[PDB]
């Protein structure tokens, strides 16, 4: 190419958007924004493919252009605006609030939350620097910078934002015994307790996580998001509790849902 690309073919779109083959050649191609385009939901896919409020992209244009969608407390008229992990999508007209949280199969769930919960979110601090007359700074996982954080906040911690002010209320430290969600790789969407972290210098660290049923899995350090302190999550968790069932017991649950219902 002679410059940056603007299209996305539909087959090369991310798998967890769950687009299908035959409706078009192109995928929505997210705008640049706070989240990575392999790691986001564009607002057009959330609003007609997940919520079924629209049937075309033209109707998503009509819904968004009435200024009806607030993502993290601000109105977005962009239909390909990249919403991402733990963003609060709040539709005021229908009185719904949503948070984007991965399912146990690594896709964003349609997780409804109460408007008490819709005033905060958790972020993961990715960078700390001191800049220009000794003012300390944060950089979170969704491109927020915060001036003057608490000096105990370090890289890989998890802070809590109030969505109106933008300021930190409190935070969790990165330690063994805290609760996780995996935000990357094979183990994506799983939830458990930190038990170990082995440090390889010059390369990626590996964190071992233990499930609520005693299953254990590793990730890398960058695929780790500290949800809660100890065992209590600071947010509401989706339908499955981050416990990935095997295919045999998922089949057993799906068959037990048919011999009882009907």
């Amino acid at each position: 190419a002679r410059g940056p690309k603007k299209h996305l073919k539909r087959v090369a779109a991310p798998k967890h958007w769950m687009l299908d083959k035959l409706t078009g050649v192109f995928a929505p191609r997210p705008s640049t924004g706070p989240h990575k385009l392999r790691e986001c939901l564009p607002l057009i896919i959330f609003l007609r493919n997940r919520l079924k409020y629209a049937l075309t992209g033209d109707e998503v244009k009509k819904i968004c252009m009435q200024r009806f969608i607030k993502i993290d407390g601000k109105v977005r008229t962009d239909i390909t605006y990249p919403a991402g992990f733990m963003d609060v999508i709040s539709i005021d007209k229908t009185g719904e609030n949503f948070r984007l949280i991965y399912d146990t199969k690594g896709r964003f769930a349609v997780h409804r939350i109460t408007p008490e919960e819709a005033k905060y979110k958790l972020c993961k601090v990715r960078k700390i620097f001191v800049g220009t007359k000794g003012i300390p700074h944060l950089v979170t996982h969704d491109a927020r910078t915060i001036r003057y954080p608490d000096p105990l906040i370090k890289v890989n911690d998890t802070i809590q934002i109030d969505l109106e002010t933008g300021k930190i209320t409190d935070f969790i430290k990165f330690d063994t015994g805290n609760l996780c969600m995996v935000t990357g790789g094979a183990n994506l969407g799983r939830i458990g307790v930190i038990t170990n972290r082995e440090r390889h210098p010059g390369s990626f660290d590996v964190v071992h996580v233990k499930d609520a049923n005693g299953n254990s899995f590793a990730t890398r350090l960058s695929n780790i998001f500290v949800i809660g302190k100890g065992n209590k999550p600071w947010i509401s968790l989706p339908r499955g509790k981050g416990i990935r069932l095997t295919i045999a017991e998922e089949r057993d649950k799906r068959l037990a849902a048919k011999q009882s219902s009907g």
Binding site: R147, Y148, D150, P151, L152
Partner: peptide, 30 residues
């Protein structure tokens, strides 16, 4: 905005200074 955040940090910096300064001399005599 700038004057309020600079004061609120310096008020918060005193606690994180003196909590470390408590355990500074705590380990030495022990």
């Amino acid at each position: 905005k700038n004057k309020e955040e600079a004061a609120e940090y310096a008020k918060l910096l005193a606690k994180r200074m003196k909590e470390a300064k408590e355990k500074r001399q705590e380990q030495i005599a022990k």
